[PDB]
Amino acid sequence: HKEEIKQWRNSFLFSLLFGIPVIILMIYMLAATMVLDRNIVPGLSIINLVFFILCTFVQTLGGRYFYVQAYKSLKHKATNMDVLIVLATTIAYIYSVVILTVAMVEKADKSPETFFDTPPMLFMFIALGRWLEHIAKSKTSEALAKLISLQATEAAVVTFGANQIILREEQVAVELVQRGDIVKVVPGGKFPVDGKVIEGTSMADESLITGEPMPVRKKPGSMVIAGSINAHGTVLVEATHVGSETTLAQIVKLVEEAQMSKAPIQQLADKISGYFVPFIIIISVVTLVTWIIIGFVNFDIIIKYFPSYSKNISKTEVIIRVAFQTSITVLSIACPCALGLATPTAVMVGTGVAAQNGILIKGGEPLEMAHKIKAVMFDKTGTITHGVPKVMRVLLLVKMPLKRMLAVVGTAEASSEHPLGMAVTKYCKEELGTELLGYCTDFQAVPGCGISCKVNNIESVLVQHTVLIGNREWMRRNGLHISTDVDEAMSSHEMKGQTAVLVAIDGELCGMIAIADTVKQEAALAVHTLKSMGIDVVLITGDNRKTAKAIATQVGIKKVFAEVLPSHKVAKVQALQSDNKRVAMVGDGVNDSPALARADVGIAIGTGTDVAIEAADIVLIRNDLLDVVASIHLSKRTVRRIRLNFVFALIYNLLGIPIAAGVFMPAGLVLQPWMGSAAMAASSVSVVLSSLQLKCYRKPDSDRYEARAQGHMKPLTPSQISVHIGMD
Ligand code: ALF
Ligand SMILES: [Mg+2]
């Protein structure tokens, strides 16, 4: 892609260098120049020779890549802008050279009129437009490198066995590791290869596949996923899949396949030129033939509207030459130069607006593509709901203040590393003055079982004796019975997908605390607005079906897909696309990266993983869900403006075609030399300024979206929503 930009820039610069003198010379000639009209030889004038040299240099240098691209397009059996420019400029230059040569041969008193100015202007403007287009198209795709970065570079190979014979611990590159070997994973170290845990117990973070941050208990006989983050101890892994067979390698393969699947999109300029080229050829040929017929039938019109009859040449020569001149004048006038600037400029401007609005759009494709979206897929964790777990409700199970118990639990749970424990501690701190945690505290934890602590610093809490935190099994083994009402409340909490834990003091049940992810404030409104616009909303997630169903009910999404693996997301996106719907994937995780790449438009939350940002084409820096709606609206406006730009690129030149062909000659209007330049000034500017107008866009207020949905919005019922587990 770099070569295209470099060569287009070189062509544009050469066209500038060898055409700016051409344009300035023609402007000076139009303004008034006797010396310029002076002839070295009767056929050729000084001005004509200068124009010939300059245009020859421009076409030889500026037009080289134009010629190559036109030939390549012809190989594809397609007529595009390059073919139009090459054909028209070559015809004009050949005709100018031929007329100059024949005038020199005939030693005519006055040099003929030449069209040497046309090729330089067309080349300059078209090269500028295509260069801007290629600047816009260029994008950086580092998702593959980010995925490779996840994989562990080195692994700890073990020798002999883990029971009673062990000799050495050595370090081997991950690639050299082979199946059947036993490796060691230290706490906080990456999992090198897929395998089974042997003689080790720990906790592994597996956000690569499932996407959630909740730690996963790993015990002997369990399976580990390469790239998962180990902690809580040292583990030994017996390899089962290595290298490409690893799940991370499969995700990389899916991402690269999705990236390669995307095909180039034909620009509207090429589509317009495809029709224009036959049209321009047809009108030129019609003008030539009709002018020849007019000259032959009467020949009085030719004399009246042209001075070439004064020449000593034969009348047939006069009519043929004037017909050719008029046809080629129509050909020159018809060609639009501003066409290349129609789509690119606006695109860039739109991108800038997005940058001002907190939406980072990479390339021009997302802006041209978002308005066609008919379905949007939302991830659950991070996208629809905050990833961090937060406390929802605390209940009291002799009658001591709730804030005191919360402070006591926070002191007991201060050293807890589990996300739920730290969430409980932060909630307690927020509720309390939280000037400082209790100095005196004794802590003991049995993993997956519960925590027992001794706190004798309740005086510190009051200024601002045993604590036990546990689940059902903790109470059952300790002998504490569970009441029917507390059991029902805990079961209701479990049904909603919110984890509940119980606090007891001095062997007596005291309270219960529930923790769950909180749906974003704008999630419900964004979903409702998307549904109102006619875009289907699908909630696809790898989290447990209960929590996914609860979140969908909260945010009012009818279709729920739970326990979805990364490949299943891509499969769903592919199916939706095959349904002729255009799918936008909103994800902020590694598992979502292949879906984002395959999805027509990938929107990545600003706080998402780096790979998710790289794979996605649109990034929400302001991490606001409603922006997804706004991103659509902007796209709409952009495309509309683009279409309008094309009108400004064509209308003026079209108005010239009737004049160039002599339609208005009886009225007394004939094409003038300045017109050919003037339209180009009128068209190109009329395009660029129009694109600049896109800067006036302002985001609609969220209050407007809520007002449009003030009464239409209504919460869903749990029974209505449907839940699907996996692709099968
Ligand atoms: F946050 Al997910 F699958 F639930 F990427
Ligand atoms: Mg996520």
UniProtKB/TrEMBL annotation:
Listed transmembrane segments: 12-31, 40-62, 83-103, 115-132, 275-299, 319-342, 646-668, 674-694
Subcellular location: Golgi apparatus, trans-Golgi network membrane; Late endosome; Membrane
Binding positions (Mg(2+)): 379, 381, 588, 592
Oligomer and partners: Monomer. Interacts with COMMD1/MURR1. Interacts with DCTN4, in a copper-dependent manner. Interacts with ATOX1. Interacts (via C-terminus) with ZBTB16/PLZF.
Protein family: Belongs to the cation transport ATPase (P-type) (TC 3.A.3) family. Type IB subfamily.
Protein name per its UniProtKB record: Copper-transporting ATPase 2
Region of the whole protein represented: 640 to 1413 of 1467
